[PDB]
Amino acid sequence: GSPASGTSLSAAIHRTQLWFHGRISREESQRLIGQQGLVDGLFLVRESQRNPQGFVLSLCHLQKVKHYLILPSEEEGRLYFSMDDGQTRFTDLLQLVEFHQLNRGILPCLLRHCCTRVAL
């Protein structure tokens, strides 16, 4: 047993590195996150130290699992995004404040996000 303080905080879930990794590239992360079969939204915000431009949103859906990174920060926007139903080419962390309650999902069946495991 160890001592603790009584202090509390009202902040969101995405306030530490708890859902952030950057050496589990799209080919590896789909092997570990793809044994799951939950709603379209069981995501992580990881990247690779291998793709020279990676900042991916990675969804776990109801038939497959896919990654959402292609371009770095631009001068005609911020972090770039272009999915057929998600042209989110601005800073995703600023949009997350709005998406928090009702997210944009993957190319969709369901739209709200929840947090998924990093390991197998």
Binding site: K64, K66, H67, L69, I70, L71, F81, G86
Partner: peptide, 10 residues
Amino acid sequence: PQPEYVNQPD
């Protein structure tokens, strides 16, 4: 493995 990304797969 496949598919890779979205905006594609890259």
